[PDB]
């Protein structure tokens, strides 16, 4: 039950110690049915070179660290053949797969809450001005939580288990794997302005040891599955 192997396209990920992978709200990603389609062009379904694991840049976890986040349609807009279909087409529809990797020795401790939030409308602290195109829309790198205790929008962290999530407890496992379906009010969506999901990992129990002082990075892989595009343009 601990050992697991995923394969999508020409990619594969192998792990030995990992708790089960969860499906968000009991669902599995699929294509668009005929009785729900709206646009009348034939969609472009490439089915390879857009269904792979794309790894992001690793971040270093320290004692004073306080959390990280990402925006899932936006983090992949300049990576590979996913980032080229997005710029030429006008609509898309897809579902993702997240895989978070962080390991240590037998003598370390710590815990991470790996949660996935739909429509995470952020908020700025102690002002009236809304945030702009800056401080959101950071491609392939993620902002750091200023006040992670209230998820930087006022809602409490203590009820953030209502979203699909797993835990990375360094005593037990070193991996977390979440499958996300298409979730939006509309059947397709413009990818350069709206972001559906928001991956966010938050260190609840900070790490600590008395062996040595060594780097411990955290790595995130994302795999868009069952993606399809429509409405061809120039750039």
């Amino acid at each position: 039950d601990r050992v697991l192997q995923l394969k999508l396209g020409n990619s594969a990920i192998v792990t030995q110690e990992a708790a089960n992978y969860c499906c968000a709200y009991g669902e599995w990603p699929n294509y668009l049915p005929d009785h729900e389609a709206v646009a009348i062009d034939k969609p472009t379904q490439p089915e390879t070179a857009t269904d792979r694991f794309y790894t992001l840049k690793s971040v270093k976890w320290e004692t004073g660290s306080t959390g990280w986040w990402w925006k899932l349609p936006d983090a992949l807009n300049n990576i590979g053949m996913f980032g080229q279909n997005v710029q030429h087409h006008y609509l898309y529809r897809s579902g993702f797969l997240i895989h978070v990797q962080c390991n240590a020795t037998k003598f370390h401790q710590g815990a991470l809450l790996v949660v996935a939030i739909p429509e995470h409308q952020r908020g700025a602290h102690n002002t009236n001005t809304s945030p702009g195109f800056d401080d959101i829309m950071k491609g392939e790198e993620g902002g750091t939580f200023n006040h992670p205790y209230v998820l930087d929008d006022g809602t409490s962290l203590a009820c953030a288990t209502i979203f699909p999530h797993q835990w990375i407890n360094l005593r037990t496992n070193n991996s977390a794997t979440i499958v996300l379906p298409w979730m939006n009010a509309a059947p397709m969506d413009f990818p350069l302005r709206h972001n559906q999901w928001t991956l966010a990992i938050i260190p609840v129990v900070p790490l600590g040891t008395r062996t040595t002082s060594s780097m411990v990075p955290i790595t995130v892989s994302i795999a868009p599955m069952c993606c399809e595009f429509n409405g061809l343009r120039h750039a």
Partner: protein
Amino acid sequence: IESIIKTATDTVKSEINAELGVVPSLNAVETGATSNTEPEEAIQTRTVINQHGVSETLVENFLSRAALVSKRSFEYKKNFFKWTINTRSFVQLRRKLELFTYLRFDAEITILTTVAVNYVGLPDLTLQAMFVPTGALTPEKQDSFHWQSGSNASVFFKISDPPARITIPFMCINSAYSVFYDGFAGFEKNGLYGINPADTIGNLCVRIVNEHQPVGFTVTVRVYMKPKHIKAWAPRPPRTLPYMSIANANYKGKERAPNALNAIIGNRDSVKT
């Protein structure tokens, strides 16, 4: 799986257990799952038939109440009332809608009005509420020509009568209302964060029909809304810190321990109190 639940569940009699290899009370919350320890397997129980109904905690019972959405008083001696429609104006209706992400309902709007002439009594008056959609031209004067429109939906009512009630269907162009929106509104590089153009309804203009007489007035208008036929998706955690504005979700926090920024729950003396 899916099943019809009318009342709460019941408990069956328990015996003593000394089984090896089986542990009900241990689990692992690192999987993201929730515990499934029945009380039959933790203590010794009796058999209890349970008649407690669960029909009051439904979503259509939790939401469908008449809540205030607008209140504004205008003097009659800009001579009328105009309100771009939002549900973020009053903080007690708002926090109950912030629990969900998507919603699909049919409202039911009641306009309640009272007057206070500033002979302290009053004769009969007549009102007019007109629902201007987006795009259409809104009036800017009491006797503008935009009030003669036969196409906009209007309603006339009096002060002496019971208040006006209509109903309004599901108006969005998508299949649900987006309470939250993590995107922009325009195709340009600099737009407005947090709003979608798929949820903009329009204006609601209210005037008083009678010509100004010898005496000035003071008219106070209240608008209530009750949802109907509610479907709801994706529950969310509730808002804890107080609100700060309407166009966004900023947060400030109170100064002292209840609902402060570094403390939601007020302090205690020690952990072993």
